[PDB]
Structure 1
Amino acid sequence: GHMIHAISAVNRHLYEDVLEQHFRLRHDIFVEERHWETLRRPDGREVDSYDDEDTVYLLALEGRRVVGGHRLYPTTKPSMMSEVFPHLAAVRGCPSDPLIWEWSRYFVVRDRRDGALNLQLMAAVQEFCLDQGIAQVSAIMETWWLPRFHEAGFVVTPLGLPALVENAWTMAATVDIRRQTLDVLHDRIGMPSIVQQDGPRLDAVARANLC
């Protein structure tokens, strides 16, 4: 059926129209729904400094329609946490490791909310990272994510004190990538695999080491 596609520099030649579609959806969702005004752009494309040649996109596709997704960025490069929110990780420190990738821009289009897609996206990050040998993901997230992580069996390590970010309680954390976590989620989503990887093989950890 419908899968989450891993899109990176090595295979984005197969996904250019999907990528542009998702940048516009990100504008509709993060700017026009969430009112994250600092991200507003006059081209109607929500693209930031962490959308470059090293970004990996995990996008939920129904045919060629983007219905959800999230992205991963190597912490061996300057990251959102290290550059924008380092104060959120003052207790434990901002991650910087080929085996830790920064996880952001999680979305589900309105048509697919409160359905099966959300748990599939949770499974997708675990599946991709385990495949790649990535040990943890790091994130800056609003505190309402904590019960969502717990519901999916995500092992969470807070990195600092929660703080207000533009009127919203926000925190920095890592999530442990676990085979055990993934196995339970595969059972729950009723599929042995949720991540589709078309085109040339991606060696994410090798690429992060170059950075």
Structure 2
Amino acid sequence: GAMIHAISAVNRHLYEDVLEQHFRLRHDIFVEERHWETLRRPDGREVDSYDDEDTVYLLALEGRRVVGGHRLYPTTKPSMMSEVFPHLAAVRGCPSDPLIWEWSRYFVVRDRRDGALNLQLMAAVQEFCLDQGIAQVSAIMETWWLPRFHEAGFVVTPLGLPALVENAWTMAATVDIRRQTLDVLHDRIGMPSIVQQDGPRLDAVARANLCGL
């Protein structure tokens, strides 16, 4: 029934309502609830430097209601990891590759927490990337993500030493995108497909090669 929709430059004309709704939800959740004060904005929309033409949004929709989601951004452009937290990836280095995208802003609305949605969101990043031929995703993440990644069968490679970021233990890591990981998650969520891709076909790797130039 309810699906996670892939929204990008090529199809956002079908999702302008939904995108605006999600920017406001990001403000409610990341700013008001989690207190990431650096992201507070007076328009009540949580929008940063990595919300632009090249961003891909994976949003869980029930009708036109956003109930969860996350976003992906190219590592071939300046990214949050490369610009804000490069020291967190000092051991292995900060990724820069059309085949590696930075994963961020993972959220679930209160009404849908501790239910089926969470594992669907985990399957969604694997499904989208595999479809696009994206090999890995990178993230700056709170260290409590490690057991969550492991529970979902994600293959994780730490990029540097954990460090305190605004009173919270944080780290940089890559996740290997795997057909094997996805197949198990499809079995667990009881659905052969969780990502809906309406409108024109997105070629993410081509777009990342372009903005790399």
Query: TM-score, normalising length from structure 2?
Result: 0.99
Residue in structure 1 matched with residue 34 of structure 2 by the alignment: 34
Q: CA deviation at 1:51?
A: 0.1
Q: CA deviation at 1:143?
A: 0.2
Q: CA deviation at 1:181?
A: 0.1
2:39, 2:94 → 1: CA distance?
23
Please give the secondary structure, in 2, of the residue aligned with 1:32.
Answer: helix
Residue in structure 2 matched with residue 137 of structure 1 by the alignment: 137
Residue in structure 1 matched with residue 90 of structure 2 by the alignment: 90
Q: CA deviation at 1:117?
A: 0.1
Write the deviation string for residues 16-55 of structure 1: whole angstroms up to 9, x where unpaired.
0000000000000000000000000000000000000000
Q: CA deviation at 1:111?
A: 0.1
Residue in structure 1 matched with residue 107 of structure 2 by the alignment: 107
Give the count of matched residue pairs: 211
Residue in structure 2 matched with residue 208 of structure 1 by the alignment: 208
Write the deviation string for residues 127-178 of structure 1: whole angstroms up to 9, x where unpaired.
0000000000000000000000000000000000000000000000000000
1:76, 1:90 → 2: CA distance?
18
2:100, 2:14 → 1: CA distance?
26
2:77, 2:20 → 1: CA distance?
24
Structure 2: runs of 5 or more not aligned = none
Write the deviation string for residues 94-133 of structure 1: whole angstroms up to 9, x where unpaired.
0000000000000000000000000000000000000000
4+ residue segments displaced more than 2 Å: none
RMSD (CA atoms): 0.2
Structure 1: runs of 5 or more not aligned = none
2:94, 2:3 → 1: CA distance?
32
> Aligned residues: percent identity?
100
